[PDB]
């Protein structure tokens, strides 16, 4: 993947996270901040979800309370390079677990 292509796709993903998390109208409080390009999501029980870019690797890294995940770009979808799961599936699963409430953007 090219550098300009990663910049385009990572920017689209970043905008998509910020919009969906700003759209959040559930019962739980979910905060989303961007600091130095890194997206931090804070939940009511103090747990966090951290999304960042790996520019040399052309990867998107996710860090939840349970573990860490690295995502390549495959078939117009961000795929975990260890299990093949999609970025949005794991993010929704982790956000739902750590918020105690369904967090889905389907």
UniProtKB/TrEMBL annotation:
Q: Tell me which domain of life the UniProt entry assigns to the organism this sequence originates from.
A: Bacteria
Q: Which InterPro entries match?
A: CyaY, Frataxin/CyaY, Frataxin/CyaY_sf, Frataxin_CS
Q: Which UniProt keywords apply?
A: Iron, Metal-binding
Record's GO cellular component terms: cytosol
- Keyword Iron listed? The answer is yes
GO BP: iron-sulfur cluster assembly
**A molecular-function term among this protein's GO annotations:** ferrous iron binding
Give the matching SUPFAM superfamilies. Answer: Frataxin/Nqo15-like
User: What PANTHER family is this protein classified in?
Assistant: FRATAXIN, FRATAXIN, MITOCHONDRIAL
Q: Which family does it belong to?
A: Belongs to the frataxin family.
Name the job this protein performs.
Involved in iron-sulfur (Fe-S) cluster assembly. May act as a regulator of Fe-S biogenesis.
Name used for this protein in its record = Iron-sulfur cluster assembly protein CyaY
Species whose genome carries this gene: Escherichia coli
Q: What is the lineage of its organism?
A: Bacteria, Pseudomonadati, Pseudomonadota, Gammaproteobacteria, Enterobacterales
């Amino acid at each position: 993947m090219n550098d300009s292509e990663f910049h385009r796709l990572a920017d689209q993903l970043w905008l998509t996270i910020e919009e969906r998390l700003d759209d959040w109208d559930g019962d739980s409080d979910i905060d989303c901040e961007i600091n130095g390009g890194v997206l931090t999501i804070t939940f009511e029980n103090g747990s966090k979800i951290i999304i960042n870019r790996q520019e040399p690797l052309h990867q998107v890294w996710l860090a939840t309370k349970q573990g860490g995940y690295h995502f390549d770009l495959k078939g117009d979808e961000w795929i975990c390079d260890r299990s093949g799961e999609t970025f949005w599936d794991l993010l929704e699963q982790a956000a739902t677990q750590q918020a105690g409430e369904t967090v889905s953007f389907r």
